[PDB]
Design a protein around this ligand. Structure first.
Ligand SMILES: O=CCc1ccccc1
Ligand SMILES: O=CCc1ccccc1
Ligand SMILES: [NH3+]CCc1ccccc1
Ligand SMILES: [Ca+2]
Ligand SMILES: [Ca+2]
Ligand SMILES: [Ca+2]
Ligand SMILES: [Ca+2]
Ligand SMILES: [Cu+2]
Ligand SMILES: [Cu+2]
Lengths: 720, 718
């Protein structure tokens, strides 16, 4: 029997186009570009003929296909985008089975507990040297597949290491004073605790809310205030900010200002309720999904690759032109780009052993009760990999993208597959280079970039990360921000109202009774670059104007002050976009005798004002606990255990256990394995254009090869 | 009948044949056509067309009617271009007007025999009348006039003509003004050097066996109060030379320390400066791929089968909520005029006129052949005139529409530049997005309309994109590629004796070749009229202040707001961490905030940023060009102030540009303002940029700030 084509293909996730003039169906799904005519015996897949056992049947204007059409066509093999990995890469993320295995091992230990949850179950990284040997020399990693299992027993953190190869527990170490990150069930717990709170229902009622059932809560971390917040450091707590559900699908637009409940998770009870002046709840419906809007007619635009892609995905490894890298997923920081090499006329040269988001922070600047503690560490306290948002095909990524699925473990230790977790796509990016010599034939070549996009949503914010591999050796990393703003309810409707001045002291009035509290977005990227080898050095090149001492009319000249940065303490600094910073390899030079290097650019621009550092007086705790905020560039000695800027356990941390710690010993950075950390952010002062929903804003970072090659990288293969 | 592939490709259309569907897909600009052999109809942008003569296959070769192209492409089904019945007042001079203007000044008794024309452009009606035409369809009741700037030998004469009444209005000689470099000067220079016995000897001394292989370059000499020993009243050019070795890239073969000074009216070398002899780098370094083989790539196409979202009526472009006028000028190139944003039915003013103001590429080497090198590409050479035709699908995406533009050449003859400007829409990631936990996702794609122009002056190639976002934001990016000006040096690697001295002012990017450090400084003139003519300049500086509200916090994030009332104060460095708005104090949005536009002179770049001019304040180039040292300028609207580097910058003795326009320090309070953005880079070379440099970009932005009352792209309410 057969099934309706349109319905079935849509369900499948393929785009369906019917051309009445050509009596032709064009079907697109990732790397597959298919063409099929009703009644035809063969179809075309990426330019290649495919015999069909059952042709497409057109009945009374409706097409029907065999129940095998989707598999015969899309899994034919004519789409070579994906190839089966023969020799499993050592950096492959834990499979579902491995996840379940690690969980059975710890549950087999005499100490496991029933309520024991899992904050992170991830692969334990083999030694860097063995992995490179595999990627480069194809030498097998004879070290056992291990996995880190970080558990949360109530409010206590426990670190366990399991041996997957030999199915045995290798270690079980409790971590005192450490708090665990926020977990999914805590969200449900908070809303439930508030719904059962007699006092809170009372507090809410005195603030104009009749039906307390329509109150939506939000789980926020409290941070650390040396006790000034009057909060017991020992307890596992969360503060709660509420909004009113008006039925417009956007509760963020209806804040219940000056009301904050403090919830103790293990005690499952409200341990405190801070109240401030009663402010009428903004009631006007402000939907952002278009329900109240007119759909504008727009002409279609498709980016197509009818013969397939230029990249191939073997297991988790991606090959594209001269690039080769491994892409995996982590529940905390998200995507991880590993063993990145560039094929230089036959020789795979090392570039980056491991790169990924390091961590990020979004601190607000309002002193009031519902804002003073608000300083989010999204990846660290919430797990952005876990909160990945499936890519909306054709919208969140261009129509010529390939969408990958990724698997991680949820908090209960059960394997979780995230559909459309990461997007891969090549894109036209203007001319690679060009020169129109007067009176001569023109010379131009197009530029192509391979983009790896991942989106994670934590509450009201939606973050987008792109890892851009330029064909010419350059690597870009941009961060985009969109979503819904965290607003403050105020009495003023316009700037003409008596309270306007005070209501807008910490933010712009972007709507009637609504203020967009100023805050910042600070991202940090951990880049373990191995510029053509592990032993590198950090070099600085400051362009300067010096007095002319060679004669002639000129009084000055443009020269450069070049010097090495021998230690971590000095490598941790502000970035002047007017200067040049390089991670060179003092052991290898190019054809001209210059050390092969990569230029590090933490700030290549952005669409919001740039954050010159953390907008905090040097005496604020947040500024103290987290030092990665005030420096745009950091360089440390390679250590497999140092991966987070804010520290491994930032939830209510008392001191800096991250970059401040990784560099406190001020170690030598001369000709050794270095790790670059780039910090970049924006200072967000709101405007009406960003409400009810914010247009995507971007920040750009860059890694350019500096004398890494001997000439224009894209000139082409030498003919003679 | 006639051959299809042959005919269609002569037409410039792309032909594709799908044997499986027995279908031809024809593409050219806004036309996307589909036609099957033997079919009685065809499809043009989604619409059915009846054919007089079906396409016929003859020996596997398609054949079509001799009227096919016209019947199909000029059918009317391609709505990209529309007829302009009422000519916009800012339309550039037409070929007929260019010829009329030249006839008028030639009919004057003062017109001398070999006069050349530096510029023949439209003398624009008053701003008010123009805005009235775009907003109210009110006719501009003023005759079309044209400015005709002439160069009589070395003398500049400014004249004004009345095109509607065909009469000469004024004829004014300009004292002490030097004219820009004209194309024929390029040839004079090469020819003068060739006939120079002295030069040939000078060259022989340096190792060149055949002087006929010496390639010259016409370089402006600047001004040095005489310290360079050059007469101020003489029209001069310095000549740097290269050796043509047959690799199609003479730039890779510098003849270092040899500089000739040429007097254009006397037509001879009036001074030769010789320095240390350096052997000419000989190794072949072609950049055209003659010695290379490109890797095979799977095809990629960007298609709009139903046509474009934009309409081009004459020179007026309509796209979504945007409406603007695009014209061409021989000096600065593309001009974006009468820009409005259609806010739910009402067209609101955004920008009266915007265009490249001017630019400069100054070098940092003190030596004999570099110290005077400070190029004002548009001002001294005419970037519009030197526009480089866009290479379809390469310099611009495959879904672009290529426009032809017309300007006058130096002899006053109309000149049509093919594919002078590219217009294309592009996907720019999600416009906005929110994936609420456990709810249906909300995403919309972003679309930008890019207007791209490429100009090439000598070795450098410059790209300019005017980017219109659906949400009201306007972006302006400048890209740079081409061939680097290099210095000949003795060192082959950094291990040689002279290596350190050879690389004191630049990187050693190849054997015996150093890419001399320099800067790329662009300036944009933006006559913004934020929802009206009368505006003010407001500064908003984010600052950290002590907490006075109580609670654990010791500090807060606040904004320091204040108006900048005059021109001198408006001329300032730009801190990308601050906010600068051009507000309209007379209009507010629904929340009581002044409708405004955020000015961002520096939104990023792929090369190191130029925080100012890499020159001591006592350098002459520094004195002559103040715009290099400040990223933001705001002055009162004046029709005659259009160039940051001044109107006649060749060998100028003082600042006649932005330095002069702001000198008076006038009031910028609630009045017609003009914004000037200066953005630049400091370029320290590397091997990856030789023999040809990969395109490098810089970005600027203009964002609506409380101009609207909400997300501009949500759409109209049902
Ligand atoms: O994203 C930061 C913390 C948060 C989590 C869930 C809802 C709102 C805010
Ligand atoms: O682009 C600046 C001046 C110039 C003109 C022609 C050839 C080389 C250099
Ligand atoms: N007086 C307008 C210029 C002109 C001249 C000749 C033909 C058409 C137009
Ligand atoms: Ca260290
Ligand atoms: Ca390293
Ligand atoms: Ca203005
Ligand atoms: Ca003025
Ligand atoms: Cu923000
Ligand atoms: Cu340059």
């Amino acid at each position: 029997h057969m099934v309706p084509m349109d319905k079935t293909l849509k369900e499948f996730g393929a785009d369906v186009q019917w051309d009445d003039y050509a009596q032709l169906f064009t079907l697109i799904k990732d790397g597959a570009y298919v063409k099929v005519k009703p009644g035809a015996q063969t179809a075309i897949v990426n330019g290649q003929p495919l015999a069909l056992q059952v042709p497409v049947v057109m009945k009374d204007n409706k097409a029907w296909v065999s129940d095998t059409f989707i598999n015969d066509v899309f899994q034919s093999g004519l789409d070579q985008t994906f190839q089966v990995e023969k020799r499993p890469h050592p950096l492959n993320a834990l499979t579902a089975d491995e996840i379940k295995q690690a969980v059975e091992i710890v549950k087999a230990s005499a100490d496991f507990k029933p309520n024991t949850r899992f904050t992170e179950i991830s692969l334990l990284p083999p030694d860097k040297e063995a992995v490179w040997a595999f990627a480069l020399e194809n030498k097998p990693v004879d070290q056992p597949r291990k996995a880190d299992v970080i558990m949360l027993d109530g409010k206590h953190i426990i670190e366990a290491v399991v041996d997957l190869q030999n199915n045995k527990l290798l270690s079980w170490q409790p971590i005192k004073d450490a708090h665990g990150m926020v977990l999914l069930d805590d969200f449900a717990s908070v809303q439930n605790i508030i719904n059962n709170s007699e006092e809170f229902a009372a507090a809410v009622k005195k603030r104009g809310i009749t039906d307390a059932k329509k109150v939506i809560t939000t789980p926020l971390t409290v941070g650390y205030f040396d006790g000034k917040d009057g909060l017991k450091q020992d307890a596992r707590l969360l503060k709660v900010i509420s909004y009113l559900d008006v039925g417009d699908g956007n509760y963020w637009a209806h804040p219940i200002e000056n009301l904050v409940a403090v919830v103790d998770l293990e005690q499952k009870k409200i341990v405190k309720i801070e109240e401030g002046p009663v402010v009428p709840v903004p009631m006007t419906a402000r939907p952002f999904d278009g329900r109240d809007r007119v759909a504008p007619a727009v002409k279609p635009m498709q980016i197509i690759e009818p013969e397939g892609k230029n990249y191939t995905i073997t297991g988790d490894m991606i090959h594209w032109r001269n690039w080769d890298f491994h892409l995996s997923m982590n529940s905390r920081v998200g995507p991880m780009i590993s063993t990145v090499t560039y094929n230089d006329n036959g020789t795979k040269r090392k570039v980056m052993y491991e790169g990924s988001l390091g961590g990020m922070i979004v601190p607000y600047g309002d002193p009031d009760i519902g804002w003073y503690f608000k300083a989010y560490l999204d990846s660290g306290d919430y797990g952005m990999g876990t909160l990945t948002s499936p890519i909306a095909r054709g919208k969140d990524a261009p129509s010529n993208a390939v969408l990958l699925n990724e698997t991680i473990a949820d908090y209960t230790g059960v394997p979780m597959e995230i559909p459309r977790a990461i997007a891969v796509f090549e894109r036209y990016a203007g001319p690679e280079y060009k020169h129109q010599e007067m009176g001569q034939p023109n010379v131009s070549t197009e530029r192509r970039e391979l983009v790896v996009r991942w989106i994670s949503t934590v509450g009201n914010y939606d973050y987008i990360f792109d890892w851009i591999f330029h064909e010419n050796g350059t690597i870009g990393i941009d961060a985009g921000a969109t979503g819904i703003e965290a607003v403050k309810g105020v009495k003023a409707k316009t700037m003409h109202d008596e309270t306007a001045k005070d209501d807008t002291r910490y933010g712009t009035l972007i709507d009637h009774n609504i203020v967009g509290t100023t805050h910042q977005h600070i991202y940090n990227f951990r880049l373990d670059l191995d510029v053509d080898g592990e032993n590198n050095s950090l070099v600085a090149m400051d362009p300067v104007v010096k007095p002319n001492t060679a004669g002639g009319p000129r009084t000055s000249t443009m020269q450069v002050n070049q010097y090495n940065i021998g230690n971590e303490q000095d490598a941790a600094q502000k970035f002047d976009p007017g200067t040049i910073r390089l991670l060179s390899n003092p052991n290898k030079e190019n054809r001209m005798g210059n050390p092969v290097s990569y230029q590090i650019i933490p700030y290549a621009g952005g669409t919001h004002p740039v954050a010159k550092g953390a907008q905090f007086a040097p005496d604020e705790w947040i500024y103290h606990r987290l030092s990665f905020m005030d420096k745009q560039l950091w360089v440390t000695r390679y250590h497999p255990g140092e991966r987070f800027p804010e520290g491994k356990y930032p939830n209510r941390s008392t001191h800096d256990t991250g970059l401040g710690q990784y560099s406190k010993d001020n170690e030598s950075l001369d000709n050794t394995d270095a790790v670059v950390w780039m910090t970049t952010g924006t200072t967000h002062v709101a405007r009406a254009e960003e409400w009810p929903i914010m247009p995507t804003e971007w920040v750009h970072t860059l890694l350019k090869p500096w004398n890494f090659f001997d000439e224009t990288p894209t000139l082409g293969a030498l003919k003679k």
